[PDB]
Amino acid sequence: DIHRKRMEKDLNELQALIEAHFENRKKEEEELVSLKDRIERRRAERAEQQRIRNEREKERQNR
Amino acid sequence: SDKLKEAETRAEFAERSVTKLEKSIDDLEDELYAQKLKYKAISEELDHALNDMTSI
């Protein structure tokens, strides 16, 4: 009886397997979207720092 | 005195830039290290599964 009860709980864990998958999949999708927005963030940051270094150069010759 | 003031202004600008870039580097550094920690974890675990293939 304890063994049959044990068998059923394993079955519970078995289907739970997919439930363990869900949190990992949401975390994966969060990493997805964060990296995708980091793409344009990096590009805009590169443009901004190029402008900043341009201002640095003009102030350099200005002194 | 005027020239000294202009040069001091430019130097302070540059130094604040230094500090801000250092902080940005810090944040990026921590994120990259954590990324590689979890990368090596998932790689080792894929290898462990392959070890499972060997046990089978």
Side-chain angles (χ1 to χ4, degrees):
Chain A
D1 146 75
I2 51 158
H3 196 83
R4 90 207 163 193
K5 165 263 179 296
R6 235 181 326 288
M7 166 270 299
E8 290 139 42
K9 66 137 176 123
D10 312 330
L11 198 220
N12 301 115
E13 183 79 31
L14 184 146
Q15 359 127 312
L17 185 64
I18 193 54
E19 270 75 24
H21 288 56
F22 298 148
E23 70 272 15
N24 304 325
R25 179 160 297 188
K26 266 75 72 175
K27 173 62 170 62
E28 280 296 325
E29 165 159 348
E30 179 182 0
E31 171 198 350
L32 182 88
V33 305
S34 50
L35 173 62
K36 267 69 177 174
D37 61 56
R38 192 49 178 132
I39 303 300
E40 55 93 21
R41 279 317 311 142
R42 284 179 71 244
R43 300 305 159 150
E45 177 173 354
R46 286 294 166 85
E48 175 189 3
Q49 301 304 317
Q50 187 54 56
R51 279 183 284 124
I52 297 170
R53 296 189 270 237
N54 283 342
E55 295 287 308
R56 301 216 206 270
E57 79 186 13
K58 280 130 0 235
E59 283 313 289
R60 165 83 194 203
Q61 76 263 11
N62 270 337
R63 79 168 176 274
Chain B
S1 67
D2 280 347
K3 300 192 296 289
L4 168 61
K5 178 56 67 179
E6 64 185 337
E8 157 197 349
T9 291
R10 291 188 170 96
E12 292 296 328
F13 182 76
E15 282 209 48
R16 304 281 70 72
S17 291
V18 172
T19 54
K20 288 197 286 294
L21 306 168
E22 281 187 307
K23 178 57 163 93
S24 83
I25 297 171
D26 186 12
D27 305 347
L28 290 172
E29 280 159 322
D30 278 357
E31 286 289 295
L32 173 56
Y33 186 38
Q35 182 63 356
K36 299 289 93 176
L37 287 181
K38 190 63 178 69
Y39 167 45
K40 268 72 174 176
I42 190 165
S43 290
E44 295 172 353
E45 281 299 306
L46 184 77
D47 302 329
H48 296 89
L50 177 63
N51 286 261
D52 312 334
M53 239 0 88
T54 82
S55 55
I56 306 156

